[PDB]
Amino acid sequence: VDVEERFNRIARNTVEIVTEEELKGLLASGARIKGYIGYEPSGVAHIGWLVWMYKVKDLVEAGVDFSVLEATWHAYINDKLGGDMDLIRAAARIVRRVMEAAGVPVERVRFVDAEELASDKDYWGLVIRVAKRASLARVRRALAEEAEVDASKLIYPLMQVSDIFYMDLDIALGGMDQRKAHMLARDVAEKLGRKKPVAIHTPIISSLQGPVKMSKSKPETAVFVVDSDDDIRRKIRKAYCPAKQVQGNPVLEIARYILFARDGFTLRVDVEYTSYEELERDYTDGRLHPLDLKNAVAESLIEVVRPIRGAVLGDPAMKRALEAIEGK
Amino acid sequence: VDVEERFNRIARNTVEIVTEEELKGLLASGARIKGYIGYEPSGVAHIGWLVWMYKVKDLVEAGVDFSVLEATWHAYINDKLGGDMDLIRAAARIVRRVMEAAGVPVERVRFVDAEELASDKDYWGLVIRVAKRASLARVRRALAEEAEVDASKLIYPLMQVSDIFYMDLDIALGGMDQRKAHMLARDVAEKLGRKKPVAIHTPIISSLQGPVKMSKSKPETAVFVVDSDDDIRRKIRKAYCPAKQVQGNPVLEIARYILFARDGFTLRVDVEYTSYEELERDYTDGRLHPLDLKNAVAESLIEVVRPIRGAVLGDPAMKRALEAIEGK
């Protein structure tokens, strides 16, 4: 069961794996396994991205040959950073630095700018073959009346699936917000003679506000890797955190997906938790108060962010890019 | 009025020009004018294509810097020749030979395979910018419930418009079946900072059968540039040709758009016509009988086809390509 350790390492903290038997079959073959994560460099990295960065670390240590696709063209399609390609590229350079400073073994990761794929006719050749095997309906349920959905929105998924096939991947890692694109890839792979990828989805940390994903939309609802210790204390203190409630609680998600992601992590509270489940029980049994959890999470998050913030702000050029980005 | 001769030369025999004032403004500027025609090399050329080939000849003699886009990727999208790219390319080599043998000054025409555009990231960059400026509805009315229309059908028009912008064209020549794509290009050009092209549409000769465009679908309803003199006599003899009727009459369309396209052409009948309008009047006034028109048109068509057929069949390689094509 060498497959068992690799599997648990890859599966740890994921929301789903489509499908586990398929992954186990891949692990059992002994053959080289290729995987990637594609993300839109849409702004300054916030802590939510750390969840998939840690997963990249897990896949790499599990023997998967990994690539990170800086999906710049996709970000452009979604008008991120006003479609300013320079700012999008800048956001990607920051992500690389954040990943390294976060402990990901970037030396073993191949970073690819979507531009390299865009320059190959064979890539567009695949975008077309993929489009020929999926109805406008099939593609539409992977995304609203026609008059409001601009055509570039239908190309997005087509490109997403083509990125996976073009890179000859056995595995597609991504947040749960990528599941629809991944299902389309799986539904189309055999028709095109391409590998049906195993889809591995990571959790998406909720907005600190309340009743919504964490993103650069409302600064106060997201903790950026460059926020000050005081900004982190404020944002966490004001965070939605229902007593005894676990579902929808971002404070608990941060504890579970980011703080306890670190093997050997401990959360000291005014009790000392050696596991997340322990904390959750005590939290459910009203034994742990929202305000006490907040402070403890805030202070631990500060330790996680401190070194990442340093690697970014302590690099003049990067600090410059960070400011250009925060400009738009 | 130097603009007047160039204009009448370009306008001669077209169904429409969107718009004439725009073309006259272009002609009047004295600036270099660029234009093209894009067509799917979807099989053996039939006489219907001669109409746009003669128009290419007119544009070139009118001073337009012209290109012919062998829209191979578009043909693939429509599964022409079973998507066999080699056969599609072969159909394009035959078209070049046919154009030359038909009298088009091919030395002054730049032939471009869609593959050259497909290899440039900037081209796909335009396909995306175009898709961002046109709703799925706008694009859909340029083409049926979602579940039957495969996604590649929405990309087709996007690529068609991008071909025009990428080649920096002032004019887009094409059959009336290209009008919808051309209107989308015109509706989008200013939004993207691209030249709004003048659209010039040529007539599409009807099927010889009756109540449908002429195409390789039903061999007997189309005259190919390589049909024998006997095949031409049979197909024309059996052709739909309502007495005194002009609308929908393919026999008359052939006379008007192909035979009289040639300056100084005469149609000798068992009367001698020096103009098409003359023939049509006499035909309307029952003065010309269907069977008499048929024979005369058949015999003249044979003279037009004879040399084209020779240039194609008299070239061994080409004859080989012709046979591979007729294989699928």
XYZ file of C-alpha atoms in Angstrom:
656
model
C 0.000 0.000 0.000
C 2.536 2.607 -1.160
C -0.504 3.915 -2.975
C -2.182 4.468 0.391
C 0.256 7.088 1.702
C 0.471 8.972 -1.599
C -3.288 8.899 -1.784
C -3.928 10.230 1.747
C -1.308 12.894 1.150
C -3.081 13.980 -2.054
C -6.584 13.600 -0.608
C -5.892 15.371 2.695
C -8.234 18.343 3.148
C -9.782 18.218 -0.305
C -13.540 18.640 -0.776
C -13.708 15.902 -3.402
C -11.707 13.748 -5.779
C -13.461 12.662 -8.997
C -12.830 9.813 -8.664
C -10.787 8.198 -5.881
C -10.676 4.807 -7.543
C -9.338 6.430 -10.686
C -6.598 8.217 -8.686
C -5.731 4.987 -6.904
C -5.503 3.245 -10.263
C -3.137 5.973 -11.469
C -1.058 5.758 -8.313
C -0.918 1.967 -8.592
C 0.364 1.955 -12.196
C 3.743 3.329 -11.163
C 3.712 5.447 -14.330
C 4.627 9.132 -14.216
C 1.645 11.268 -13.277
C 1.242 14.849 -14.501
C -0.953 17.479 -12.917
C -1.508 21.202 -12.712
C -3.593 23.976 -11.245
C -4.676 26.887 -13.400
C -5.578 30.148 -11.738
C -6.369 33.694 -12.807
C -3.717 36.155 -11.557
C -6.505 38.591 -10.756
C -5.039 40.694 -7.958
C -3.039 40.512 -4.743
C -3.012 37.006 -3.311
C -5.215 36.582 -0.246
C -5.061 33.724 2.256
C -7.676 31.689 0.423
C -5.148 30.848 -2.253
C -2.846 29.341 0.380
C -5.202 26.343 0.504
C -4.455 25.364 -3.085
C -0.776 26.320 -2.721
C -0.434 23.826 0.161
C -2.175 21.239 -2.002
C 0.367 21.883 -4.767
C 3.001 21.120 -2.133
C 1.202 17.844 -1.279
C 0.947 16.682 -4.930
C 4.621 17.415 -5.543
C 5.677 15.428 -2.444
C 3.393 12.638 -3.627
C 5.430 12.233 -6.806
C 3.177 14.137 -9.282
C 5.037 16.122 -12.004
C 3.376 19.476 -11.420
C 2.772 22.666 -13.362
C 1.082 25.890 -12.398
C -0.657 27.609 -15.310
C -0.694 31.384 -14.909
C -4.022 31.705 -16.749
C -3.421 35.246 -17.939
C -5.672 35.055 -20.996
C -8.481 33.706 -18.831
C -8.050 36.650 -16.423
C -8.200 38.977 -19.398
C -11.419 37.331 -20.531
C -12.880 38.073 -17.088
C -11.540 41.648 -17.279
C -9.470 41.242 -14.104
C -7.289 44.284 -13.363
C -9.064 46.050 -16.221
C -7.580 43.629 -18.727
C -4.168 45.200 -18.147
C -1.900 42.296 -19.093
C 1.121 43.877 -17.357
C -0.712 44.000 -14.036
C -1.953 40.450 -14.511
C 1.617 39.269 -15.117
C 2.726 41.220 -12.066
C 0.112 39.461 -9.945
C 1.584 36.134 -11.170
C 5.155 37.091 -10.207
C 3.852 37.835 -6.715
C 2.063 34.480 -6.535
C 5.354 32.690 -7.318
C 7.074 34.543 -4.490
C 4.204 33.856 -2.125
C 4.253 30.144 -2.944
C 7.979 29.898 -2.239
C 7.756 31.890 0.987
C 4.781 29.728 1.979
C 6.934 26.631 1.815
C 5.962 25.226 -1.567
C 8.980 23.589 -3.298
C 8.780 25.868 -6.359
C 12.033 24.487 -7.769
C 10.121 21.301 -8.587
C 7.160 23.192 -10.107
C 6.967 24.286 -13.746
C 5.357 27.733 -14.014
C 3.711 28.329 -17.394
C 2.242 31.589 -18.694
C -0.896 30.974 -20.816
C 0.930 32.946 -23.537
C 3.120 29.926 -24.256
C 0.028 27.868 -24.994
C -1.593 30.711 -26.954
C 1.423 30.763 -29.304
C 0.942 27.198 -30.408
C -1.457 26.492 -33.239
C -1.923 22.987 -31.867
C -3.388 24.458 -28.712
C -6.054 26.352 -30.691
C -6.436 23.230 -32.767
C -7.540 21.523 -29.501
C -9.796 24.377 -28.514
C -11.617 23.724 -31.796
C -11.747 19.946 -31.499
C -13.098 20.362 -27.975
C -15.730 22.832 -29.168
C -16.871 20.341 -31.831
C -17.619 17.725 -29.184
C -19.751 19.823 -26.862
C -23.108 21.435 -27.582
C -23.711 25.091 -26.780
C -25.980 23.651 -24.095
C -23.342 21.314 -22.661
C -20.878 24.225 -22.665
C -23.483 26.568 -21.250
C -24.162 24.364 -18.246
C -20.431 24.666 -17.533
C -20.733 28.407 -16.944
C -28.574 34.133 -17.997
C -30.221 34.876 -21.344
C -28.154 35.054 -24.539
C -28.232 38.866 -24.772
C -26.186 39.301 -21.556
C -23.579 36.538 -21.876
C -20.772 37.758 -24.144
C -19.274 35.046 -26.387
C -15.857 35.139 -24.722
C -17.561 33.460 -21.735
C -18.171 30.335 -23.795
C -14.574 30.261 -24.993
C -13.244 30.398 -21.394
C -14.278 26.781 -20.497
C -13.205 25.557 -23.932
C -9.745 26.977 -23.211
C -9.761 25.609 -19.656
C -10.408 22.066 -20.900
C -7.867 22.527 -23.697
C -5.216 23.661 -21.206
C -5.649 20.328 -19.390
C -5.472 18.237 -22.570
C -2.664 20.281 -24.136
C -0.509 19.768 -21.012
C -1.237 16.046 -21.198
C -2.512 15.903 -17.632
C -3.667 12.942 -15.540
C -4.846 15.320 -12.788
C -6.514 18.722 -12.584
C -6.297 20.435 -9.186
C -8.485 23.437 -8.480
C -10.980 25.065 -6.169
C -14.582 23.882 -6.203
C -15.303 26.820 -8.488
C -13.489 24.894 -11.260
C -15.647 21.761 -10.957
C -17.905 22.548 -13.881
C -14.987 23.065 -16.272
C -13.421 19.855 -14.969
C -16.592 17.821 -15.530
C -16.747 19.083 -19.107
C -13.125 17.980 -19.579
C -13.930 14.513 -18.218
C -17.067 14.245 -20.355
C -15.096 15.092 -23.469
C -11.709 13.413 -23.013
C -12.521 9.960 -24.457
C -14.319 11.428 -27.486
C -11.111 13.299 -28.397
C -8.664 10.545 -27.549
C -7.320 12.580 -24.619
C -6.656 11.466 -21.028
C -9.747 11.722 -18.788
C -8.323 13.741 -15.868
C -8.869 12.982 -12.212
C -10.369 16.205 -10.761
C -9.124 17.246 -7.276
C -11.011 20.105 -5.666
C -9.876 22.227 -2.731
C -12.230 24.212 -0.436
C -12.945 27.890 -1.066
C -12.713 29.935 2.151
C -15.796 32.135 2.665
C -15.964 35.919 2.929
C -15.313 37.276 6.424
C -18.533 39.318 6.093
C -21.153 36.589 6.481
C -23.979 35.151 4.295
C -19.735 34.532 -0.930
C -16.109 33.565 -1.630
C -13.122 35.468 -0.249
C -11.837 37.847 -2.939
C -10.366 41.300 -3.602
C -13.918 42.737 -3.994
C -14.413 44.102 -0.445
C -10.940 44.481 1.160
C -12.346 44.033 4.670
C -13.834 40.634 3.807
C -10.499 39.173 2.721
C -7.083 38.884 4.329
C -4.314 39.641 1.829
C -0.810 38.218 2.163
C 0.415 41.781 2.585
C -2.079 43.066 5.163
C -0.511 44.474 8.350
C -0.782 42.607 11.667
C -3.308 45.270 12.723
C -5.364 44.834 9.510
C -5.505 41.091 10.222
C -6.608 41.638 13.846
C -9.363 44.030 12.714
C -10.660 41.883 9.852
C -10.722 38.736 11.976
C -12.245 40.510 15.000
C -15.123 41.739 12.794
C -15.509 38.356 11.040
C -18.761 36.387 10.879
C -18.396 33.655 13.516
C -21.727 32.173 14.803
C -21.447 30.542 18.221
C -21.286 26.728 18.119
C -21.852 26.951 14.342
C -19.441 25.260 11.928
C -21.112 25.621 8.528
C -20.381 28.907 6.768
C -18.020 29.978 9.566
C -14.920 31.498 7.809
C -12.980 31.761 11.069
C -13.219 28.015 11.537
C -12.435 27.379 7.845
C -9.251 29.425 8.208
C -8.303 27.375 11.276
C -9.025 24.111 9.524
C -7.729 24.762 5.998
C -4.841 27.102 6.667
C -3.616 26.952 10.288
C -3.959 23.197 10.861
C -2.809 22.508 7.296
C 0.651 22.679 8.894
C 1.633 19.317 10.383
C 2.364 19.700 14.077
C 0.316 22.899 14.438
C -1.120 23.916 17.799
C -3.722 26.572 18.613
C -3.232 28.004 22.133
C -6.436 29.622 23.487
C -7.504 31.424 26.685
C -6.866 25.232 26.140
C -4.296 24.043 23.587
C -5.596 22.290 20.463
C -3.505 19.697 18.684
C -6.121 18.889 16.051
C -8.831 20.795 14.232
C -11.555 18.309 15.106
C -10.803 18.860 18.794
C -11.258 22.603 18.342
C -14.520 22.076 16.447
C -16.016 19.846 19.137
C -15.079 22.292 21.904
C -16.459 25.055 19.683
C -19.712 23.202 19.073
C -20.106 22.354 22.763
C -20.070 26.104 23.459
C -16.812 25.372 25.283
C -15.026 27.768 22.931
C -16.219 31.350 22.587
C -16.259 33.207 19.221
C -14.188 36.085 20.540
C -11.610 33.710 22.013
C -11.368 31.787 18.740
C -11.067 35.069 16.804
C -8.075 36.339 18.798
C -6.280 33.015 18.664
C -6.865 32.597 14.942
C -5.882 36.207 14.277
C -2.614 35.833 16.144
C -1.707 32.511 14.449
C -2.622 33.900 11.002
C -0.252 36.751 11.673
C 2.598 34.239 12.116
C 1.685 32.517 8.863
C 1.504 35.808 6.989
C 4.533 37.577 8.494
C 7.182 35.733 6.456
C 5.110 35.785 3.238
C 4.519 39.511 3.630
C 8.249 39.974 4.181
C 9.323 38.120 1.030
C 6.958 40.277 -1.006
C 7.415 43.723 0.540
C 11.131 43.203 1.114
C 11.689 42.930 -2.648
C 11.692 46.483 -4.136
C 10.631 45.510 -7.662
C 7.873 43.332 -6.278
C 6.802 46.080 -3.909
C 6.616 48.252 -7.031
C 4.455 45.710 -8.832
C 2.273 45.377 -5.748
C 1.636 49.120 -5.819
C 0.899 49.236 -9.553
C -1.619 46.441 -8.955
C -3.283 48.204 -6.036
C -3.431 51.234 -8.321
C -6.130 49.866 -10.651
C -14.523 60.639 -61.571
C -11.660 58.114 -61.603
C -13.613 56.730 -58.685
C -16.537 56.108 -61.035
C -14.803 53.551 -63.268
C -13.163 51.695 -60.377
C -16.495 51.660 -58.624
C -18.523 50.289 -61.566
C -15.820 47.705 -62.145
C -16.046 46.589 -58.499
C -19.841 46.859 -58.333
C -20.554 45.087 -61.631
C -22.783 42.046 -61.075
C -22.735 42.148 -57.291
C -25.931 41.621 -55.283
C -25.056 44.370 -52.813
C -22.303 46.596 -51.486
C -22.570 47.651 -47.821
C -22.220 50.515 -48.371
C -21.587 52.171 -51.746
C -20.884 55.574 -50.264
C -18.301 54.010 -47.987
C -16.607 52.291 -50.966
C -16.665 55.532 -52.927
C -15.095 57.302 -49.965
C -12.363 54.651 -49.886
C -11.814 54.906 -53.623
C -11.680 58.701 -53.404
C -8.999 58.774 -50.676
C -6.332 57.492 -53.044
C -4.964 55.393 -50.173
C -4.077 51.736 -50.685
C -7.113 49.508 -50.294
C -6.859 45.925 -49.037
C -9.440 43.222 -49.566
C -9.923 39.484 -49.542
C -12.350 36.641 -50.012
C -12.340 33.714 -47.620
C -13.763 30.418 -48.768
C -13.928 26.857 -47.488
C -11.978 24.466 -49.755
C -14.773 21.946 -49.323
C -14.562 19.868 -52.491
C -14.108 20.088 -56.248
C -14.788 23.583 -57.536
C -18.089 23.924 -59.385
C -19.086 26.769 -61.701
C -20.743 28.739 -58.924
C -17.348 29.670 -57.556
C -16.414 31.226 -60.904
C -18.688 34.154 -60.005
C -16.528 35.178 -57.059
C -13.319 34.325 -58.944
C -14.295 36.810 -61.686
C -15.037 39.359 -58.975
C -11.549 38.806 -57.542
C -10.293 39.629 -61.036
C -12.379 42.846 -61.031
C -11.105 44.023 -57.605
C -7.496 43.400 -58.602
C -7.900 45.398 -61.844
C -9.554 48.128 -59.792
C -6.380 48.612 -57.763
C -7.325 46.660 -54.581
C -4.434 44.747 -52.909
C -6.089 41.342 -52.760
C -5.727 38.149 -50.765
C -7.571 34.871 -50.948
C -7.872 33.121 -47.585
C -7.965 29.344 -47.957
C -10.197 28.938 -44.889
C -9.049 25.424 -44.086
C -9.807 25.569 -40.364
C -13.304 26.822 -41.135
C -13.843 23.877 -43.519
C -12.658 21.566 -40.773
C -15.147 23.126 -38.379
C -17.900 22.319 -40.891
C -16.501 18.786 -41.305
C -15.974 19.231 -45.054
C -14.221 16.249 -46.664
C -14.576 14.451 -43.336
C -12.245 16.929 -41.673
C -9.351 15.455 -43.645
C -6.980 18.429 -43.724
C -4.927 16.925 -46.582
C -7.984 16.727 -48.822
C -9.012 20.243 -47.846
C -5.554 21.531 -48.793
C -5.777 19.593 -52.039
C -9.091 21.262 -52.851
C -7.337 24.638 -52.338
C -4.478 23.779 -54.722
C -7.109 22.975 -57.345
C -8.903 26.276 -56.733
C -5.642 28.165 -57.398
C -5.220 26.344 -60.699
C -8.838 26.934 -61.630
C -8.555 30.650 -60.885
C -5.482 30.999 -63.092
C -6.986 28.981 -65.937
C -10.162 31.049 -65.569
C -8.231 34.209 -66.308
C -7.729 35.606 -62.822
C -4.311 37.341 -62.513
C -3.138 35.077 -59.667
C 0.366 36.560 -59.749
C -1.115 39.695 -58.181
C -3.104 37.729 -55.568
C -1.715 36.653 -52.194
C -2.962 33.163 -51.295
C -3.013 32.541 -47.539
C -3.703 29.249 -45.762
C -5.671 29.786 -42.512
C -2.813 27.884 -40.827
C -0.612 30.972 -41.077
C -3.164 32.944 -39.092
C -3.726 30.068 -36.650
C 0.000 30.118 -35.790
C -0.074 33.675 -34.563
C -1.077 34.328 -30.981
C -2.179 37.810 -32.006
C -4.793 36.277 -34.260
C -6.322 34.319 -31.354
C -5.884 37.443 -29.291
C -8.309 39.096 -31.776
C -10.687 36.171 -31.739
C -10.975 36.793 -27.992
C -11.327 40.563 -28.183
C -14.023 40.086 -30.812
C -15.836 37.549 -28.637
C -15.821 40.022 -25.726
C -17.689 42.598 -27.794
C -20.540 40.425 -29.016
C -23.232 38.721 -26.959
C -24.011 35.044 -27.456
C -27.241 36.402 -28.926
C -25.521 38.804 -31.323
C -23.201 35.965 -32.376
C -26.091 33.539 -32.577
C -28.035 35.703 -35.001
C -24.945 35.505 -37.221
C -25.359 31.753 -37.653
C -31.858 25.809 -33.431
C -31.920 25.041 -29.706
C -28.695 24.943 -27.680
C -28.557 21.132 -27.461
C -28.045 20.736 -31.242
C -25.626 23.575 -32.032
C -22.091 22.451 -31.165
C -19.867 25.219 -29.745
C -17.468 25.215 -32.695
C -20.319 26.825 -34.675
C -20.095 29.944 -32.530
C -16.332 30.130 -32.958
C -16.638 30.009 -36.783
C -18.058 33.588 -37.139
C -15.674 34.864 -34.467
C -12.800 33.540 -36.587
C -14.351 34.885 -39.796
C -14.516 38.416 -38.373
C -11.021 38.046 -36.909
C -9.634 36.973 -40.292
C -10.889 40.281 -41.736
C -9.449 42.396 -38.913
C -6.185 40.444 -38.689
C -5.562 40.999 -42.426
C -6.252 44.700 -41.927
C -8.913 44.783 -44.623
C -10.927 47.696 -46.015
C -13.086 45.268 -48.029
C -14.586 41.818 -47.534
C -15.771 40.089 -50.718
C -17.965 37.021 -50.455
C -21.153 35.307 -51.511
C -24.437 36.386 -49.955
C -24.044 33.443 -47.599
C -21.288 35.438 -45.836
C -23.463 38.505 -45.182
C -24.255 37.672 -41.584
C -20.588 37.255 -40.648
C -19.810 40.500 -42.469
C -22.507 42.446 -40.611
C -21.105 41.202 -37.310
C -17.654 42.412 -38.400
C -19.057 45.846 -39.273
C -21.008 46.036 -36.012
C -17.885 45.267 -34.023
C -15.056 47.040 -35.853
C -15.283 50.478 -34.179
C -15.595 48.977 -30.684
C -12.250 47.206 -31.221
C -10.468 50.025 -33.004
C -10.424 48.010 -36.240
C -11.368 49.120 -39.769
C -15.106 48.760 -40.501
C -14.986 46.764 -43.761
C -17.043 47.485 -46.842
C -18.921 44.210 -47.548
C -19.230 43.183 -51.239
C -21.536 40.261 -51.922
C -21.682 38.154 -55.076
C -24.725 36.086 -56.179
C -25.001 32.394 -55.329
C -26.088 30.336 -58.358
C -29.035 28.045 -57.540
C -29.189 24.256 -57.732
C -30.032 22.896 -61.185
C -32.752 20.763 -59.542
C -35.370 23.413 -58.773
C -37.052 24.783 -55.590
C -31.022 25.558 -52.635
C -27.468 26.634 -53.522
C -25.287 24.808 -56.044
C -22.921 22.485 -54.161
C -21.208 19.081 -54.202
C -24.221 17.544 -52.360
C -26.125 16.142 -55.378
C -23.642 15.854 -58.299
C -26.408 16.239 -60.888
C -27.492 19.599 -59.456
C -24.053 21.162 -59.867
C -21.642 21.539 -62.762
C -18.057 20.879 -61.665
C -15.063 22.401 -63.436
C -14.027 18.872 -64.358
C -17.336 17.499 -65.653
C -17.217 16.116 -69.213
C -18.913 17.954 -72.095
C -21.571 15.212 -72.005
C -22.094 15.609 -68.223
C -22.630 19.342 -68.785
C -25.141 18.740 -71.610
C -27.092 16.277 -69.440
C -27.125 18.404 -66.284
C -28.166 21.534 -68.164
C -30.770 19.697 -70.276
C -32.414 18.400 -67.070
C -32.123 21.781 -65.296
C -35.060 23.656 -63.768
C -35.918 26.381 -66.295
C -39.523 27.758 -66.051
C -40.756 29.374 -69.258
C -40.678 33.191 -69.209
C -39.593 32.976 -65.546
C -36.440 34.752 -64.361
C -36.512 34.365 -60.576
C -35.013 31.112 -59.309
C -34.021 30.092 -62.848
C -30.427 28.674 -62.570
C -30.032 28.446 -66.345
C -30.555 32.180 -66.645
C -28.307 32.862 -63.623
C -25.515 30.907 -65.306
C -26.008 32.964 -68.475
C -26.018 36.217 -66.561
C -23.340 35.626 -63.913
C -20.936 33.366 -65.751
C -21.355 33.529 -69.550
C -22.016 37.269 -69.901
C -19.492 38.013 -67.149
C -17.023 37.932 -70.056
C -16.857 41.311 -71.799
C -17.739 40.926 -75.460
C -19.656 37.667 -74.945
C -22.343 36.588 -77.394
C -24.969 33.852 -77.053
C -25.965 32.413 -80.462
C -29.393 30.694 -80.351
C -31.657 28.841 -82.812
C -31.028 35.052 -82.547
C -27.657 36.332 -81.307
C -27.570 38.066 -77.915
C -25.000 40.730 -77.165
C -26.286 41.479 -73.671
C -27.921 39.507 -70.892
C -30.831 41.907 -70.521
C -31.687 41.355 -74.186
C -31.800 37.603 -73.608
C -33.974 38.048 -70.513
C -36.528 40.216 -72.308
C -36.774 37.780 -75.227
C -37.009 34.994 -72.650
C -39.754 36.755 -70.714
C -41.691 37.568 -73.889
C -41.842 33.816 -74.560
C -39.679 34.631 -77.582
C -37.000 32.302 -76.216
C -37.832 28.689 -75.424
C -36.397 26.854 -72.367
C -34.993 24.028 -74.454
C -33.345 26.468 -76.860
C -31.803 28.418 -73.982
C -30.618 25.158 -72.373
C -28.710 23.962 -75.451
C -27.122 27.338 -76.064
C -26.097 27.763 -72.439
C -24.821 24.186 -72.273
C -22.656 24.643 -75.341
C -21.215 28.000 -74.164
C -20.553 26.608 -70.661
C -18.605 23.822 -72.286
C -16.281 26.412 -73.872
C -15.788 28.128 -70.527
C -15.067 24.846 -68.772
C -12.905 23.155 -71.424
C -9.698 25.088 -70.680
C -10.220 24.997 -66.889
C -10.813 21.253 -67.019
C -7.650 20.895 -69.093
C -5.403 22.799 -66.676
C -6.627 20.587 -63.847
C -6.764 17.146 -65.463
C -3.653 17.769 -67.546
C -1.570 18.083 -64.367
C -0.838 14.541 -63.041
C -0.343 15.506 -59.390
C -3.489 17.594 -59.470
C -5.377 14.801 -61.186
C -4.169 12.645 -58.289
C -5.442 15.134 -55.729
C -8.729 15.384 -57.605
C -9.168 11.625 -57.296
C -8.260 11.512 -53.600
C -10.876 14.228 -53.064
C -13.562 12.399 -55.022
C -12.647 9.381 -52.906
C -14.151 10.686 -49.647
